[PDB]
């Protein structure tokens, strides 16, 4: 499913992401925009053989199991396919663990490179939040 911008903002907010670990809703919408272009089905293989899954491109090296990332951890205790669903609950709950890991949203390279320091509030503009 490809979310609309305000549709995603509302679902992230419903699932507790607004200001989670201090990151305002616009940070999460921005991260999703540049990680997956709001597409829950996005996948991207990494050089180390791991794969990033879903609207927030969660990595199989640490966070989910895809059965093909030797020596990976599965810290969110989920199959990576669960991160591809139209319902973003699993992605949100795993993102809450990632952002709590010590590095904040710097765990998302696209957030660091394209959202951090910017006017992330623009990403929830005009939404009935
Ligand atoms: Cl957009
Ligand atoms: Na901010
Ligand atoms: Na894994
Ligand atoms: Na949802
Ligand atoms: Na980037």
Token digits of residue 81:
């396919």
Closest-approaching ligand to the CA atom of 26: 2
Whether residue 129 lies inside any domain: the answer is no
Residues known to be catalytic = 35, 52
Instruction: Give the CATH number of the domain where residue 92 resides.
Output: 1.10.530.10
Phi, psi of 123 (to 5 degrees): -70, -15
Q: Residue 85 sits in which domain range?
A: 5-124
- Technique used by the depositors: electron diffraction
Tokens of 92: 């949100």
For ligand 3, the distance from its centroid to the CA atom of residue 117, given in whole angstroms, is 31
Q: Which of 75, 33, 36, 66 is nearest to 48 (CA)?
A: 66
Closest among 15, 27, 18 to 85, alpha carbons compared: 15
Number of domains in the chain: 1
Helices (H) and strands (E) in the chain, counts: 4, 3
Q: What is the experimental resolution, given in Å to one decimal place?
A: 1.8
């Amino acid at each position: 499913k490809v979310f609309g911008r305000c549709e995603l903002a509302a679902a992230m907010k419903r699932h507790g992401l607004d200001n989670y670990r201090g990151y305002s809703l616009g940070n999460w919408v921005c991260a999703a925009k540049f990680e997956s272009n709001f597409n829950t089905q996005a996948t991207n293989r990494n050089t180390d053989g791991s794969t990033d899954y879903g609207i927030l491109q969660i990595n199989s090296r640490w966070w989910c199991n895809d059965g093909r990332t030797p020596g990976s951890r599965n810290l969110c205790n989920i199959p990576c396919s669960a991160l591809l669903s139209s319902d973003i609950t699993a992605s949100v709950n795993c993102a809450k663990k990632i952002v709590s890991d010590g590095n904040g949203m710097n765990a998302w390279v696209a957030w660091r490179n394209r959202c951090k320091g910017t006017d992330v509030q623009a990403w929830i503009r005009g939404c009935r939040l």
